[PDB]
Predict the structure.
Amino acid sequence: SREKYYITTAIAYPNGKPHIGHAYELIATDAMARFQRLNGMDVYFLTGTDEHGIKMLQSARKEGITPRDLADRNTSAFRRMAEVLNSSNDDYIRTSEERHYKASQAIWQAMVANGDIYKGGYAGWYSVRDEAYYGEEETEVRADGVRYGPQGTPVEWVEEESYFFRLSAYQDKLLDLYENNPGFIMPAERRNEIVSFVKSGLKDLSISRTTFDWGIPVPGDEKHVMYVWVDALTNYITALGYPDTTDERWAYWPANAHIIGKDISRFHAVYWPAFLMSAQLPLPKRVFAHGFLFNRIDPFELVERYGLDQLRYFLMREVPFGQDGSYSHEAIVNRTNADLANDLGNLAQRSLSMIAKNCEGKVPQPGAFSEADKAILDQADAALETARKAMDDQALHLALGAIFAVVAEANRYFAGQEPWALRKTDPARMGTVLYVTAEVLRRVGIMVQPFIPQSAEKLLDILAVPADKRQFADVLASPLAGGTDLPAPQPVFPRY
Ligand SMILES: COc1cc(Cl)cc(CNCCCNC(=O)Nc2ccccc2)c1
């Protein structure tokens, strides 16, 4: 019985087209999910779309179609993005689906049963100019006879009927969660902003609207529809068949990792665990927030220009996962050409071309390993353990850095050994250097699979590695057998 691993992306708002922020999140989470599959886990990987709300109703009114029709049309682009990005998601969740309507209504009833939902209103001062709420003390009536907020704009007393979740009851329980799980909300900078926020006191949370019907109705009060909080976050349990706990997929709960953007960190580390606690459900083991990408841009055009695995590699390598980063035409071209086309690509071509020409297209029979041979072989084995430990802390750049440090060293190894000169001098020793090179390329090939799957598959194909020997366990246990026929080598990473 393989151990279970549930991982998710935050669900995208399909109000516009797919931006690069959505692509980045999906790529990172896809790589993590693939990594765990290869590491032996029973993986479930989810992504999807948040389709309700006032902005979506208004967009639909503008184009002269129903909100559902619009939701269908715009979400197809996000489905197509997942396909073009080579996403290995086992399901695609859409908030408009019946299964989500039932699951959101179920968790709402569970929270009503726990005594955490009441009907009331959100009565206070609102600045229409600042688009924010204020307490009375932050305001001041001026000579106008008009009340102003703290930013010098008028405020107006807005009053709207709303259901509330009793978030004020979960302060001490959430603080206990953070003390008992240091890794619940990462990276470290996110945690501190969450702990500081919860310490300063939590007020009860508005969870329904009366201003639009494009939403999930509130049970026993259909004039209200559910606001974003209960709707969007419940997608993670909808995908496992909630509220049916007899479903085969329900064993995947709790989620091992919710991968999200930094902007929605509060909603996944404060509101979401409070809801789960109220509904008598276990909490996710980690929420990891990534940073944003700036242009120092449409993900379909980037993939077409630079290549998919080139983009996947760059985003995961150059930006430390958690921090903000940049991408430019110059940076993508340089770093992919250097690491993929030159370092990994040419090392495969030079070595495997020598096997095709000098060793009759067969893996050479290796003799004794020198101290140089051992070092590069052991460094490749050690990269897997550094990669495993890094991926537990969502440090994708550190995983790729360790794997491509082996590639860089293997190039220096191959060059120092001078196999070309050994062809005349000592053919048997040439065979050993070429064996060692191919063997390191196999180990690297297996290890890079989650990050660059199609290109990794090609490399392993030209090493004649069978389909059932491409797990991480095969790095130590399934080395290349001398005498095996290899197909004619072709370049895996063409230069830009
Ligand atoms: C609820 O916290 C979030 C959870 C996830 Cl998984 C993702 C996000 C980020 N999505 C963008 C938010 C904009 N969408 C929105 O407000 N939808 C909405 C509005 C009213 C009623 C139901 C959904 C926010």
Observations:
- The chain has three domains: 1-115+229-327, 116-228, 328-496.
- The pocket of 415 is lined by residues 10-11, 13, 50, 52-53, 215, 227-229, 231-233, 264, 267 (CB under 6 Å).
- The radius of gyration is 27 Å.
